mmCIF file of C-alpha atoms and ligand atoms in Angstrom:
data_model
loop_
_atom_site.group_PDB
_atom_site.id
_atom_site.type_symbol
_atom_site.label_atom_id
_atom_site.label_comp_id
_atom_site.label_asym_id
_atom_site.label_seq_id
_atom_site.Cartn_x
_atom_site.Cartn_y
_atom_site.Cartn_z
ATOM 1 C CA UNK A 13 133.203 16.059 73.116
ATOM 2 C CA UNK A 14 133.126 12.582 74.400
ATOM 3 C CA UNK A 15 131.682 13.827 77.757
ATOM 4 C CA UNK A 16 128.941 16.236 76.863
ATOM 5 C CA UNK A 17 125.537 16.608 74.597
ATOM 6 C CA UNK A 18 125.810 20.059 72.983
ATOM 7 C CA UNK A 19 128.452 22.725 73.496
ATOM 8 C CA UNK A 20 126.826 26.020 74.215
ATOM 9 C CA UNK A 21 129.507 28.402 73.891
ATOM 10 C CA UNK A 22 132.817 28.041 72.095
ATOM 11 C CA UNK A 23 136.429 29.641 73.293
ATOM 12 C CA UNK A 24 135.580 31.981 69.952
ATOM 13 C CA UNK A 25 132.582 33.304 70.905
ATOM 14 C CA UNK A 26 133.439 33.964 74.469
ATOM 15 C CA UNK A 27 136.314 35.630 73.620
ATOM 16 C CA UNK A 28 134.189 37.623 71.002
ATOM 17 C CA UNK A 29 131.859 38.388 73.821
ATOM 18 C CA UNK A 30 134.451 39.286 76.138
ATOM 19 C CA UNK A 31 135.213 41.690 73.156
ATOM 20 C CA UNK A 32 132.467 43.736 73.425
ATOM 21 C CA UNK A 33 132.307 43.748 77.223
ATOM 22 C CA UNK A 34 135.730 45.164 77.326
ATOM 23 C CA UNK A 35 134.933 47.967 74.790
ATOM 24 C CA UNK A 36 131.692 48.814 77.699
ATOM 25 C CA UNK A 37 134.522 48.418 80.781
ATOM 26 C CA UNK A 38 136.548 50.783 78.787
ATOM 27 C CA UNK A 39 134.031 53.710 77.954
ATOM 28 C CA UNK A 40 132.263 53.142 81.689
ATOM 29 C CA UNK A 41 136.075 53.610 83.032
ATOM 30 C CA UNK A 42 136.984 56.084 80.708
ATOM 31 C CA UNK A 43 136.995 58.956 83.085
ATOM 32 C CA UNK A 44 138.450 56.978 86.183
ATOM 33 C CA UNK A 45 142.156 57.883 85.334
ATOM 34 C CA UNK A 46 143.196 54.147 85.108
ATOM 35 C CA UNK A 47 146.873 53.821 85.310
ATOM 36 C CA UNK A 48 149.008 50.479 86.006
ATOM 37 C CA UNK A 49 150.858 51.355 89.301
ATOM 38 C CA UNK A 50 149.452 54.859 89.938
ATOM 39 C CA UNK A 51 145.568 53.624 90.110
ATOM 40 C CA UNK A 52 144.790 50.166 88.243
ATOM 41 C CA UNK A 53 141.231 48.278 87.837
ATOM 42 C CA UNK A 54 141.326 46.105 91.186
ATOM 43 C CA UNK A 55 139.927 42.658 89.753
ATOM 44 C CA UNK A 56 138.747 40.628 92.412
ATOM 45 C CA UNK A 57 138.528 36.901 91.027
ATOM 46 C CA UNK A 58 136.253 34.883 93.186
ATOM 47 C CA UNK A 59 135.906 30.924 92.908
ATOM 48 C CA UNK A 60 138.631 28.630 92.068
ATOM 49 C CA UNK A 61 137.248 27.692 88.793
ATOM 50 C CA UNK A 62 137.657 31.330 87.581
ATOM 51 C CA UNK A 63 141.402 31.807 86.634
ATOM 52 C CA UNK A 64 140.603 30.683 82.906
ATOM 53 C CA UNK A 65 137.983 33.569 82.820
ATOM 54 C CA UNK A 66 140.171 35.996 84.319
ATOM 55 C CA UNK A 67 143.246 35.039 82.835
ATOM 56 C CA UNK A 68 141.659 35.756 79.252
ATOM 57 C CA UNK A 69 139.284 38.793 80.804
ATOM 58 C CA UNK A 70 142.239 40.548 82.309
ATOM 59 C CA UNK A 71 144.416 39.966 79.238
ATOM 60 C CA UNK A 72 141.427 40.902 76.805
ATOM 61 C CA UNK A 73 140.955 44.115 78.963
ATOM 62 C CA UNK A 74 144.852 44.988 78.662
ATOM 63 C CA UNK A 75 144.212 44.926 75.169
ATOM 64 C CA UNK A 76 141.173 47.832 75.076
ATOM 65 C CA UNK A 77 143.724 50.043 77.674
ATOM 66 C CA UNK A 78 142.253 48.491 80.703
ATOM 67 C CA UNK A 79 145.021 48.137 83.029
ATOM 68 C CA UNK A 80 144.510 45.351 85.837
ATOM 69 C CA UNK A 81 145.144 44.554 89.451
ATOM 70 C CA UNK A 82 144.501 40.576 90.316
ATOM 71 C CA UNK A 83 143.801 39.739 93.706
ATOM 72 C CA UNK A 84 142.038 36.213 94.109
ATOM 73 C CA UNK A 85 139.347 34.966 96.974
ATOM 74 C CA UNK A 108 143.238 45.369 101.820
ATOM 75 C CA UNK A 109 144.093 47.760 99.507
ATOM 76 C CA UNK A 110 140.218 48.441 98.295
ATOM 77 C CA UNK A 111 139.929 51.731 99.920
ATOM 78 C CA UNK A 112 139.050 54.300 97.584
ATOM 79 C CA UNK A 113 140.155 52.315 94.593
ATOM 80 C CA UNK A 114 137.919 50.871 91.991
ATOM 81 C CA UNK A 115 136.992 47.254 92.010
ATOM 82 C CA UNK A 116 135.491 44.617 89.660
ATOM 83 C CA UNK A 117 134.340 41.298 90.408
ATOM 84 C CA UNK A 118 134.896 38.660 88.314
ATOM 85 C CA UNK A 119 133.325 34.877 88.853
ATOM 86 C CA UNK A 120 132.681 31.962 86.547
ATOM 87 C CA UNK A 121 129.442 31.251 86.942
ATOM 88 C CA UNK A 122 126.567 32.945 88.671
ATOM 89 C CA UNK A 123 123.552 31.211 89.716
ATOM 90 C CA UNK A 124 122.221 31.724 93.170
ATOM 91 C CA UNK A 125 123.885 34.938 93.426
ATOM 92 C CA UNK A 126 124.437 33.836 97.405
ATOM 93 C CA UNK A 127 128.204 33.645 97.200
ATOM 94 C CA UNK A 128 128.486 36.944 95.279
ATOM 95 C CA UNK A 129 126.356 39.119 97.387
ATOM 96 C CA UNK A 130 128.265 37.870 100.221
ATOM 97 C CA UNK A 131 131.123 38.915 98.336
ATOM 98 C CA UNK A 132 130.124 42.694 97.331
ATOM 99 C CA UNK A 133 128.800 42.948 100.722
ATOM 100 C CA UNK A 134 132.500 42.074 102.181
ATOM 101 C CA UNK A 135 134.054 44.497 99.303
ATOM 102 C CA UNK A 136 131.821 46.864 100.096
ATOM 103 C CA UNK A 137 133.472 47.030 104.011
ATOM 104 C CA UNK A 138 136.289 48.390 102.773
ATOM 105 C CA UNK A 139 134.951 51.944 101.254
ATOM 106 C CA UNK A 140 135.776 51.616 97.164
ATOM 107 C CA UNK A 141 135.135 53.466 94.492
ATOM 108 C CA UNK A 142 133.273 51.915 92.633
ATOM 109 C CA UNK A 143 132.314 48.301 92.822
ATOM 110 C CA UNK A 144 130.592 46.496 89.929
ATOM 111 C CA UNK A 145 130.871 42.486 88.746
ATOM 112 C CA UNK A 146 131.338 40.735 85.224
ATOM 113 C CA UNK A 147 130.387 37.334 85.167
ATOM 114 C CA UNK A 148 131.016 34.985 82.530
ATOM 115 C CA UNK A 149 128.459 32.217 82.706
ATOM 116 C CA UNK A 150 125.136 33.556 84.276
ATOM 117 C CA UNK A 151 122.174 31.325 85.295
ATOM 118 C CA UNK A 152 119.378 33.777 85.785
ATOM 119 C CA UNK A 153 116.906 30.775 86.491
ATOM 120 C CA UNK A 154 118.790 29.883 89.725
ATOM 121 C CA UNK A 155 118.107 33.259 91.579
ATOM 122 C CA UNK A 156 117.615 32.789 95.207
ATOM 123 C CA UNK A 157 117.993 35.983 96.196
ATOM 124 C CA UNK A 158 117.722 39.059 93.188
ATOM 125 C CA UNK A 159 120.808 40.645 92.202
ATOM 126 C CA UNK A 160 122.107 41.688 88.697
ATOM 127 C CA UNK A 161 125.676 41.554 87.802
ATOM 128 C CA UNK A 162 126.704 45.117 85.658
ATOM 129 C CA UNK A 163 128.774 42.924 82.366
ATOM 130 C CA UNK A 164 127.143 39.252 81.426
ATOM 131 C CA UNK A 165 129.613 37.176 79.077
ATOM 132 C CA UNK A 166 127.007 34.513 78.081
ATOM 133 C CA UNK A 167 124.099 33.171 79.885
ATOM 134 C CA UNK A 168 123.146 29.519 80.104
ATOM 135 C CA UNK A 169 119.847 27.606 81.232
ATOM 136 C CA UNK A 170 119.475 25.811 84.355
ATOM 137 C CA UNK A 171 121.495 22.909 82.801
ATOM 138 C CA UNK A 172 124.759 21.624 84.348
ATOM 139 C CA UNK A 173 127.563 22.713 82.563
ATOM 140 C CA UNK A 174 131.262 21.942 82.607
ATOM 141 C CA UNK A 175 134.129 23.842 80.603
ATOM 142 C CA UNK A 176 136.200 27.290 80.844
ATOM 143 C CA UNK A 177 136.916 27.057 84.831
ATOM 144 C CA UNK A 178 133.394 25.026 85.570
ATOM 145 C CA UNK A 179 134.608 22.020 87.084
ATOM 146 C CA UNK A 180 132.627 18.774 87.638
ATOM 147 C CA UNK A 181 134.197 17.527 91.321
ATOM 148 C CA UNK A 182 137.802 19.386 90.096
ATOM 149 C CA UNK A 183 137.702 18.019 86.258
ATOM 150 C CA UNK A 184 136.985 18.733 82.567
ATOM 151 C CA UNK A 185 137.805 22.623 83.902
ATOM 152 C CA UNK A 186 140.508 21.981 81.132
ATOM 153 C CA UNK A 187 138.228 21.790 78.224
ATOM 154 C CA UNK A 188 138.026 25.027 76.125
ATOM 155 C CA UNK A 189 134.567 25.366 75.497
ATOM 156 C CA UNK A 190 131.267 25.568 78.428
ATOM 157 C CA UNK A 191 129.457 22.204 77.531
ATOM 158 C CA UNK A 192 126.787 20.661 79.004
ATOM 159 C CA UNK A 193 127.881 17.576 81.041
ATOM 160 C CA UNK A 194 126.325 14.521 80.168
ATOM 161 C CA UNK A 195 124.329 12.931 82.398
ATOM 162 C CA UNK A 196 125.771 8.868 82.212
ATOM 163 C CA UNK A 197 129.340 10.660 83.608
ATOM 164 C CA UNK A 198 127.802 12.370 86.723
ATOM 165 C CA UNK A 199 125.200 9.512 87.444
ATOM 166 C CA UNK A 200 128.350 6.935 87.495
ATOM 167 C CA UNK A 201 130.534 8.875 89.423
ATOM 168 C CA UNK B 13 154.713 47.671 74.581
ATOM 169 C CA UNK B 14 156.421 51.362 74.516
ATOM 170 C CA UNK B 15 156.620 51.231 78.745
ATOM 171 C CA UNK B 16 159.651 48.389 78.119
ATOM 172 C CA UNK B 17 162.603 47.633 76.441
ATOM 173 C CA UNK B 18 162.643 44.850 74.461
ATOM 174 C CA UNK B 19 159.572 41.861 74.047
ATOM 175 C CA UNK B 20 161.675 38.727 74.780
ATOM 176 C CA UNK B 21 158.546 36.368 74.398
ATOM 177 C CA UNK B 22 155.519 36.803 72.455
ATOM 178 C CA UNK B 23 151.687 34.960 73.329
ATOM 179 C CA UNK B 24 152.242 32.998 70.022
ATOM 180 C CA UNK B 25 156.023 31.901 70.747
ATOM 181 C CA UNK B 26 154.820 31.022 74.478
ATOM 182 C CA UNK B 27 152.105 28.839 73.226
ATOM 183 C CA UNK B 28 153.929 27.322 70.452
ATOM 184 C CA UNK B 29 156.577 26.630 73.039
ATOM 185 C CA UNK B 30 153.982 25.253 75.343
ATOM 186 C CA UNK B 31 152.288 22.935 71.974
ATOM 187 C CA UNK B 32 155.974 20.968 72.006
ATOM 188 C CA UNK B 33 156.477 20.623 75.691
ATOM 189 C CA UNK B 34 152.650 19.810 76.002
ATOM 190 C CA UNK B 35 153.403 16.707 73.426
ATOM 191 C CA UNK B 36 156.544 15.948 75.587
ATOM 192 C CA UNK B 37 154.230 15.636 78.543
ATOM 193 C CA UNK B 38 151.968 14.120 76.977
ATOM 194 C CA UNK B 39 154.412 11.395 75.890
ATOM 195 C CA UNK B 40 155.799 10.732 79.483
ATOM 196 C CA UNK B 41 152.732 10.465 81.231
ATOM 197 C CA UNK B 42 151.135 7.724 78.389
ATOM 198 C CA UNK B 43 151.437 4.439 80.328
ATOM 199 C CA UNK B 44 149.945 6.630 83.676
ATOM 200 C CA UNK B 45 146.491 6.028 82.585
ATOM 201 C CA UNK B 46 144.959 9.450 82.869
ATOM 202 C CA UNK B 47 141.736 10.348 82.556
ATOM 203 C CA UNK B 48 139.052 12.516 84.349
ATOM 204 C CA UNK B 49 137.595 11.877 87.583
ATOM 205 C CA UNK B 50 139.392 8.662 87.919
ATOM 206 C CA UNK B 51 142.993 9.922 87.886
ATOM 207 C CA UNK B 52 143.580 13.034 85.901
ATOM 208 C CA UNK B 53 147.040 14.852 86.464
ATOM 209 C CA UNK B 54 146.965 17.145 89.571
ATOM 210 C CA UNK B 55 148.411 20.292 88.687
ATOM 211 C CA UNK B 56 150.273 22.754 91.589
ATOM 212 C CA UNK B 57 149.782 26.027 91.075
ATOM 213 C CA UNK B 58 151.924 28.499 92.745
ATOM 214 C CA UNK B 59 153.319 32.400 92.863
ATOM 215 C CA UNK B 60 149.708 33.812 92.445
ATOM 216 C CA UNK B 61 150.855 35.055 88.564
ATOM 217 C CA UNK B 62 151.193 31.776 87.355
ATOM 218 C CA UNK B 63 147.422 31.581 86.749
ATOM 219 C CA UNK B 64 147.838 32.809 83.163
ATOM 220 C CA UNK B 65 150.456 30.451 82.943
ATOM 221 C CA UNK B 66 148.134 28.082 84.226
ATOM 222 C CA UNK B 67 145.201 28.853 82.467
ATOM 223 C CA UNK B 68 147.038 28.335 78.848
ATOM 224 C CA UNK B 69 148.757 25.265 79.494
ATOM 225 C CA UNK B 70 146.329 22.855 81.338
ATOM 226 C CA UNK B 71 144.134 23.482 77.567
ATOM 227 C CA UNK B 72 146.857 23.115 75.901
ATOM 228 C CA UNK B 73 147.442 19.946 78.081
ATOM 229 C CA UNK B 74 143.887 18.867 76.925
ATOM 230 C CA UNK B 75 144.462 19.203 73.219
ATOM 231 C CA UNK B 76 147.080 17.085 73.940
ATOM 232 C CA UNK B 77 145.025 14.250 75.812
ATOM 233 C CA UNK B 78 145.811 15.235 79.188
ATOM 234 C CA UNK B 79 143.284 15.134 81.740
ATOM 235 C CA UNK B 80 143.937 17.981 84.550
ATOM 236 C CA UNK B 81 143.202 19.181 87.984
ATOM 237 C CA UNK B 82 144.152 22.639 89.116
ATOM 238 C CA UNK B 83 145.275 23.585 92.663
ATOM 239 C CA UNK B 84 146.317 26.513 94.037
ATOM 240 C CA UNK B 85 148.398 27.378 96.638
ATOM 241 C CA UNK B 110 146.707 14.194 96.813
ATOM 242 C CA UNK B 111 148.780 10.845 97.843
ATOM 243 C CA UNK B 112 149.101 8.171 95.079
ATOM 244 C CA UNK B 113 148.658 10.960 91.726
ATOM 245 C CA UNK B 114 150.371 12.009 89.836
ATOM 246 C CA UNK B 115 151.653 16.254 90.446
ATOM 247 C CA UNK B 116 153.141 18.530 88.218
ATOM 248 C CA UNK B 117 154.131 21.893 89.719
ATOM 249 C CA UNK B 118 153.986 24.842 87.236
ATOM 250 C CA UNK B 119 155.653 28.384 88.298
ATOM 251 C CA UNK B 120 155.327 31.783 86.197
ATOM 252 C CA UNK B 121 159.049 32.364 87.015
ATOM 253 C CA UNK B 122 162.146 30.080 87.725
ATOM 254 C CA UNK B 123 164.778 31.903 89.443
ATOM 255 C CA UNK B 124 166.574 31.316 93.018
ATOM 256 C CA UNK B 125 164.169 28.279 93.187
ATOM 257 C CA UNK B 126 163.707 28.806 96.567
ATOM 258 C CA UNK B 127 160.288 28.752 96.149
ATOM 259 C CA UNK B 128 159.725 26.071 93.837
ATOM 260 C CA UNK B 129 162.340 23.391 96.133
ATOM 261 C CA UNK B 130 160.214 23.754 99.411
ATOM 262 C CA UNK B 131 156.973 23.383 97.671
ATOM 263 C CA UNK B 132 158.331 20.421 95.909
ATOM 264 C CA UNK B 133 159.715 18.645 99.034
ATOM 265 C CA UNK B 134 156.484 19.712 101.618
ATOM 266 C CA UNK B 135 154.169 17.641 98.314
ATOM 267 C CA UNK B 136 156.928 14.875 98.535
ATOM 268 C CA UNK B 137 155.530 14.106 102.461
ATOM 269 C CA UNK B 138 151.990 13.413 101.030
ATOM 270 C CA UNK B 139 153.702 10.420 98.986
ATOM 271 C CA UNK B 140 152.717 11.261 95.698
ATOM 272 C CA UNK B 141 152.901 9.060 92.877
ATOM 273 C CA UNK B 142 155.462 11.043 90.602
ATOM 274 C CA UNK B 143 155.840 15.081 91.244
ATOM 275 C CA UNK B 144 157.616 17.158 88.118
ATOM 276 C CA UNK B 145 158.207 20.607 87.674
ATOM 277 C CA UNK B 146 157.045 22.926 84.721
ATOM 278 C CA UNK B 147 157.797 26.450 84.319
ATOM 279 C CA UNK B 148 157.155 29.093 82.071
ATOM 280 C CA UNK B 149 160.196 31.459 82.601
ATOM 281 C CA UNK B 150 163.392 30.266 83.957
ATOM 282 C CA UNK B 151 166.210 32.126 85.265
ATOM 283 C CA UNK B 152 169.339 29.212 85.055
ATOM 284 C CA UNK B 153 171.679 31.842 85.830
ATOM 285 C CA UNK B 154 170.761 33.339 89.444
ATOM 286 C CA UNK B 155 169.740 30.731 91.338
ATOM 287 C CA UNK B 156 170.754 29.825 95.182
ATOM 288 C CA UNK B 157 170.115 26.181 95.479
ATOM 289 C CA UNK B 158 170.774 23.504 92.398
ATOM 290 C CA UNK B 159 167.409 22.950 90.839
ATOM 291 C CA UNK B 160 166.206 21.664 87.325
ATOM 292 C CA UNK B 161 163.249 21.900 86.516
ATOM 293 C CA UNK B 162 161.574 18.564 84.517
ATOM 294 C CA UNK B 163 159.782 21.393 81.643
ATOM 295 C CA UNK B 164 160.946 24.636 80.834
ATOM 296 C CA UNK B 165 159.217 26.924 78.375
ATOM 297 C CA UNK B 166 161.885 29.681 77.702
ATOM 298 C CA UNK B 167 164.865 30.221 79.182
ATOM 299 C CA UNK B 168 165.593 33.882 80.624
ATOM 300 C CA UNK B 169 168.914 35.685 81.651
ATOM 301 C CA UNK B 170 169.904 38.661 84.455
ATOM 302 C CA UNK B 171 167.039 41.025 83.589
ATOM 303 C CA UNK B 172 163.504 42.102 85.134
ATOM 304 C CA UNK B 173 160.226 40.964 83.277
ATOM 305 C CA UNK B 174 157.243 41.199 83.109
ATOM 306 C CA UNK B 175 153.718 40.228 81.843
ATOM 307 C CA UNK B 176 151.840 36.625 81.293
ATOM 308 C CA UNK B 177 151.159 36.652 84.929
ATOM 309 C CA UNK B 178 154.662 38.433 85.638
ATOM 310 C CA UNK B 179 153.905 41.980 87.538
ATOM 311 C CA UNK B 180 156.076 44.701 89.240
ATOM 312 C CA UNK B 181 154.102 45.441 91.848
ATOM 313 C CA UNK B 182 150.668 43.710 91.375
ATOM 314 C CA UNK B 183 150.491 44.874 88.205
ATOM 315 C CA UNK B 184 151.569 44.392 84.203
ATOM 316 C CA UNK B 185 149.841 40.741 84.185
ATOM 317 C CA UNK B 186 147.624 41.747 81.659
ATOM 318 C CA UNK B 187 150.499 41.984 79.370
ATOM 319 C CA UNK B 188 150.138 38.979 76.930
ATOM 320 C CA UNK B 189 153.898 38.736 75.939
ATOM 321 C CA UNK B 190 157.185 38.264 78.122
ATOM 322 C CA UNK B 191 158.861 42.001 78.146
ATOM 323 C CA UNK B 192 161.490 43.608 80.224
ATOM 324 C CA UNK B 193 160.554 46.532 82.143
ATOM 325 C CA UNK B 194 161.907 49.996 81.299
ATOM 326 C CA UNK B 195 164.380 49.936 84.032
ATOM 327 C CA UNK B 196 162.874 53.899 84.951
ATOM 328 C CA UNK B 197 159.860 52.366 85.849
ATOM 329 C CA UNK B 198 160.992 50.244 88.746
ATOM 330 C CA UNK B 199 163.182 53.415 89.431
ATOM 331 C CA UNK B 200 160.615 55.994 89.130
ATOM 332 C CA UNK B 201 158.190 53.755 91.218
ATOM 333 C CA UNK B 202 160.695 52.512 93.392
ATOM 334 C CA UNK B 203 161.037 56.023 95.113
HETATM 335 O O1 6QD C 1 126.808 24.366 85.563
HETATM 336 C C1 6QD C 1 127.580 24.491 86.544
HETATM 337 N N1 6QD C 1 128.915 24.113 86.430
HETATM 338 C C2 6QD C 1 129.783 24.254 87.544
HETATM 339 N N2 6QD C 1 129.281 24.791 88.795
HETATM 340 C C3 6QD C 1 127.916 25.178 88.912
HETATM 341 C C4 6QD C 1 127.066 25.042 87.834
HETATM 342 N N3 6QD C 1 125.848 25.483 88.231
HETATM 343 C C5 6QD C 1 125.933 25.870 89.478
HETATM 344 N N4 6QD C 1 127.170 25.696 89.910
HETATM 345 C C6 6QD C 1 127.648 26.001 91.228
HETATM 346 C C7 6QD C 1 127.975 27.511 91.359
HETATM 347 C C8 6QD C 1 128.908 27.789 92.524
HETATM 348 C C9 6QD C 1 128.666 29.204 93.193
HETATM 349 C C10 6QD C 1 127.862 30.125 92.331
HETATM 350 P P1 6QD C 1 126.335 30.621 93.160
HETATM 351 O O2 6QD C 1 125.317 29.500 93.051
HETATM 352 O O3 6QD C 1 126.622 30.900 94.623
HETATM 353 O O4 6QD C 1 125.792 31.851 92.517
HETATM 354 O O1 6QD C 2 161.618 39.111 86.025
HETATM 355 C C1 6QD C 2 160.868 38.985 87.023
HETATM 356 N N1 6QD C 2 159.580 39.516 86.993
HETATM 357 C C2 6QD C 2 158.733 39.371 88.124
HETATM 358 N N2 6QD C 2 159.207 38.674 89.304
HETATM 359 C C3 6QD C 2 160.524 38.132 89.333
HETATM 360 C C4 6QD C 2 161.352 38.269 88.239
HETATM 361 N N3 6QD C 2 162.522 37.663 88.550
HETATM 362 C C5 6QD C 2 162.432 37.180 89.762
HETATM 363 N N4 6QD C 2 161.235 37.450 90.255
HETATM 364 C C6 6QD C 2 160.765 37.082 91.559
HETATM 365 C C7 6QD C 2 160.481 35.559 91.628
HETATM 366 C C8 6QD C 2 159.823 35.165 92.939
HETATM 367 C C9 6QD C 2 160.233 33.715 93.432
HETATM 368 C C10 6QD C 2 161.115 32.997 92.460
HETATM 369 P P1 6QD C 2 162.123 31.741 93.278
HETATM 370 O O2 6QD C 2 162.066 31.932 94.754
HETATM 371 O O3 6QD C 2 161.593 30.362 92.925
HETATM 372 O O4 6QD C 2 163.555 31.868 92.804
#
């Protein structure tokens, strides 16, 4: 890429990772009489930047006989809810999140993130299903924007430094 | 697919749809100098579904040289609308004229589905992935009743699910 150093994860192995979370959705859902219509998997995408991962999450989950609600950031009550967000670092804007979900009286409430940034913790807080995890490096790619850019490129790069010292 | 009736699109004929009118944008949009950051094309998001739609085509867009930024829901860019579904355009015509107010520098229109045949007001849209007649479908962002999004192909609903449900 002419914008980046190294790409850390490719659209195959996310997908491939997304693979094997779906199988863990599916068997930790098994029991939880998920049916489209009657009683769906509420997904809660959170962050603008996450429609690529939930696009392909939801669809991948479709796929293992996870059916899917989409509501992006009610009808939580007693219904089960995952989160999903791009990228996790401080955890702040999640926790708020869960917190808020949590108002409403679900089922069960659990979040999948797809990049997570364990080294950028400012309060604790583990997210159930991890796609990938990254260092505390700037990255752009799969959603992760860069002031509303490169959210087009297909694979989670880093973003070299020249482009965001120039802008 | 044994909840619907026939699979009028698949994910493959979509995208390979979406590969020739990503060229075809790609082609108009040469001499507009686009690139990130700077000027990349500002892409209007609308109907909540269409982020599947979304998702897919602005990386498809990029394979194609075509620098992107998402919005969901600005005066001298370039915009190009994109819509899951094409029908009464209703929708679609007082989106297009309340972005015309901001003076943009040329607004299009690309949608995924389009229904030519049921519509209220003349509208023709600039791209059009697949072309759709009287009949209900769903999946690639397309739901009946928040859900079947997950569905990676363009299907028509069994019609005694929207008549079993309806009640
Ligand atoms: O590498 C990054 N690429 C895009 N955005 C980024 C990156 N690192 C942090 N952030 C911002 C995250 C926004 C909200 C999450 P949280 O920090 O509240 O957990
Ligand atoms: O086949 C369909 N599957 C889901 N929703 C559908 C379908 N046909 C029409 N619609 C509703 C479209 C909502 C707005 C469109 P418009 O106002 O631009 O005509």
């Amino acid at each position: 890429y002419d914008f980046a150093t190294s790409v850390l994860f490719t659209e195959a192995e996310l997908h491939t990772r997304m693979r094997g979370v779906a199988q863990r959705i599916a068997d930790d859902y098994s029991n939880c009489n998920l049916k489209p219509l009657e009683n769906p998997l509420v997904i809660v995408s959170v962050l603008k930047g996450s429609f690529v991962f939930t696009a392909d999450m939801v669809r991948i989950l479709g796929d293992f006989g996870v059916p899917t609600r989409v509501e992006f950031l009610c009808d939580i009550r007693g219904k089960h809810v995952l989160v999903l967000e791009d990228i996790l670092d401080t955890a702040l804007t999640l926790r708020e999140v869960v917190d808020s979900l949590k108002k409403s009286e679900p089922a069960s409430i659990k979040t999948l993130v797809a990049i997570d940034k364990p080294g950028g913790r400012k309060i604790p807080f583990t997210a159930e299903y991890v796609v990938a995890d990254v260092p505390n490096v700037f990255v752009v790619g799969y959603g992760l924007d860069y002031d509303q850019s490169y959210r087009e490129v297909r694979d989670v790069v880093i973003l070299k430094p020249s482009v965001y010292e120039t802008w």
